[model samples]
Target chain A: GAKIGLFYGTQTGVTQTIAESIQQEFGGESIVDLNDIANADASDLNAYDYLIIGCPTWNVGELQSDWEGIYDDLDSVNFQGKKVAYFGAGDQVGYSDNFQDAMGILEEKISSLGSQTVGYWPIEGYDFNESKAVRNNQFVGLAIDEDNQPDLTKNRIKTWVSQLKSEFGLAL
Target chain B: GAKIGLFYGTQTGVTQTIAESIQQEFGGESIVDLNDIANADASDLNAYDYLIIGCPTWNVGELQSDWEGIYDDLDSVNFQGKKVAYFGAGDQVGYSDNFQDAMGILEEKISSLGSQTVGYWPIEGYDFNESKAVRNNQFVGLAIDEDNQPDLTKNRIKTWVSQLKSEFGLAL
Candidate 1:
């Protein structure tokens, strides 16, 4: 079994719920809150062979408050030989112009640190004006819209986790 | 007048020439080489109001040697109120799959640091299968093809520099 480190930052706890769902799907242990004092060290990132990170977009395409707190500290970690995947929560209808922008921001930071990023989600189902989360016609990771489409969240998580199994080289 | 700082990393000097041309167009003096020990400090990046950075793609979309050397140090610089632009040299015909990937990489780095990125170039008139440099149907910055389309370099630079002047809020 691959060692997985799952982390997320949340203010309203929507992102935390999604992070727990992702962790359950992976059959992994408890997830870490990026804002938590005990487990938020950037160096802890190196302990995992695979990483699953999540965040929510706020304001006009900005990162959630928790993620924003330790954003720069991420640069201190050495992501070489690590595999990372990102997921994000955003309101498509309310924030159509910059949906899931926080995920895009986090993904770029980790990828620049030499992590092999995986789990690119298709952009077909989402309706939004634009996103930094999109690259090569795909979202950087799974996109969840709990506010507008709560019913779709469960299915999207299940499908994405299944896809991640293959992408992460885990036997189904 | 906008305080423009031009910086570039070159192995074969092609990127330096392009950088100098861009600097000349801006009527700026003295470009900084990212590999130059005397002036390559990342803190120096904050001294400029508008930053023009360049690098050449190497070995399957990798950054030029000098840029790779100082890549991480960029995180130390605060780009809160700066405006940044990027230009990259690549052989679009030979490395069409990853043309100007270095520019895309650098643009993402500085933009993540909170710089207001400008000078997006059109994707029209270029032939390439895929590029990380492409976003929303436009290049992150000017794309240069010194290997195959040398004939077009000067005109492209002139046009892009003119566009940057407008984008940088400077009088043309």
Candidate 2:
């Protein structure tokens, strides 16, 4: 079963919107806030074949506060061979030096846990000076900047999910 | 006569605190919030031979909402040969990427209007990835991260004010 599950930690609802869009793309059965699940723990990560994690960068590059608790739990979960994708909202023009930095942190942890990650978005068209999300000149995953450029978000999500579908070997 | 007047636009009390501290260092008569000044207008800028403007950077390098109103008034006022400095509060570890962006914008507009801006801060100790306030590899003004480095605020203020006094050729 190619069951896709999406989890999000958010503050200002921007990150949540990205999750909602991703949910609409994949369907409702696979989406939830990270804390909504009963007795959630790191071990719960084992249930998914395809996982999409969403969060917002706060206070520079800090992960949203809610995600902090779950971050420790992830140490106990083994994500060997699982497919993971990341999506996040941040202020690119304002936080360009570390744009989508939370996503960078998330991607590193998941990959280090042996998860197979996908959906690297291009850095083109964004007016950022630097980003921790950038690796060898590309973002680790989808990055959305809702403040300075709300108009681009819908298209970015659509394009990112389309790329994800192909990455998971699903028909585009 | 070098009359230095400080004005600040703030939401959280952090920017206000910085203004208060600066007032204590120089004199109480020299500082006022942009909001508190009665019948304030862009032309009010002429009262001071030196101006110390403060603001906070909001999302994606946006100015605080209050400052946005005054931004228009600035265009109508002349800053010809006026000496100026800037300061701002932001989340360094969290907003490091766009740290002090609002101050950067302020410095640009004021300088373009012919103000001789000073008090550029060193970027060495801060861990930000990028900032609009950075020019020639230095901040355009004093940058404070109240949330992450509250303890350092006093020292930073003390140091910045000393620099400003020197730039204005005043005996501190």
Candidate 3:
């Protein structure tokens, strides 16, 4: 069985909650916080065949605290032969110009390290002026708006998780 | 004399020490820490026409924790017609691949916001493999290595401050 590694960073706990939901859908053992000193090292990333990374956009488009802590460490890890996905929480109305930009940043970094990216989400429902997370009219990964569009988060997560399962070649 | 705004982020206080030295050189009124709750907002940035922004690269090339917090807020402030300078603390031998990357990142962001970037430091004396802070055979700003080359930091700051004063059109 291929091992799944789920990691996230949160300031207000919203991103962590989303990570938990994604972990539940995947039935993964335990999720890791990028701030956790015990298990958040870049070396830990090499142990997983499939990686699910998440972070919340702060202010406008900045990465969350813990994610920023490990931003450079990602360069040290070789994601070759690994599959990666991203999820991010942002405010669509308040920060419409750069919604979920952190997710895009992470996705770009991981992709540059030779990992296969999965779980891209549709951008039809979002009304943002700009985003780095968008490509081919789709998001780089799951985008959650817990502020303005809270009602859609659950269903979006459920659908995105299922999509990830298929993309990761996991048995449904 | 044009008002100066010196903002910095620090973890082990070394960065703050550097900031203090810079403030003393300019005889500035006070300095602001990005982590300080009272006066670290983006609006504080508009109070001065000359900006000296500093941060230390952490782990590999990660921005120090405090700087990460206010990174996005920088976009909200209009930097048009402002002159900005940057200085960063990094270990060249230890994190040689990403020395002073945070300074480069900040410089790029400030430049994009319509600020005139000053204080291009020479790369002559340092040894490093790669860095985002390098451009046209010079560093984006002053690069300090308190870890491996503590002796050079003081002299570097003195020289950089004089350069900044001249570049900002202030009496040196």
Q: DockQ of each model against the real complex?
A: 0.06, 0.01, 0.01
lDDT of 3 by residue, B1-172 (tens): 3377778877778888888888777765443223231247988888788888878887764677777778879989988667778888888988887788788677766654556667777788898876666632467688889888898888888888888777776763
TM-score of each: 0.53, 0.49, 0.48
lDDT of each: 0.74, 0.71, 0.74
Task: Tell me how much of the true interface, by contacts, candidate 3 captures.
Answer: 0.00
For candidate 3, give the lDDT of residue A128. Answer: 87
lDDT of 3 by residue, A36-140 (tens): 322478877888788888877867645677777788898889776677888888888888877887887777667545566667677898888767676324676
State which candidate, 1 or 3, has the greater TM-score: 1
**Residue B124, candidate 3: C-alpha displacement in angstroms:** 0.6
Query: Model 1 compared with the native: what TM-score?
Result: 0.53
Encode model 1's per-residue lDDT on B142-165: one tens digit a residue: 888888888999999989988877
lDDT, candidate 1, A1-172, per-residue tens: 2367777777777887888788777675643223231348778776777788887786874667767777779888877567678888889999998888777777766764556567778878888877877743478789999888899999999899888777666745
Model 1: chain B TM-score relative to the native chain B: 0.90
Candidate 1, residue B82: Cα displacement in angstroms equals 35
Q: What tier of docking accuracy does candidate 2 attain?
A: incorrect
Q: Which ten residues in a row have the lowest lDDT in candidate 1 chain B?
A: B30-39
Instruction: State how far residue A95 of model 1 sits from its true place (Å).
Output: 0.8
Candidate 2 accuracy as lDDT: 0.71
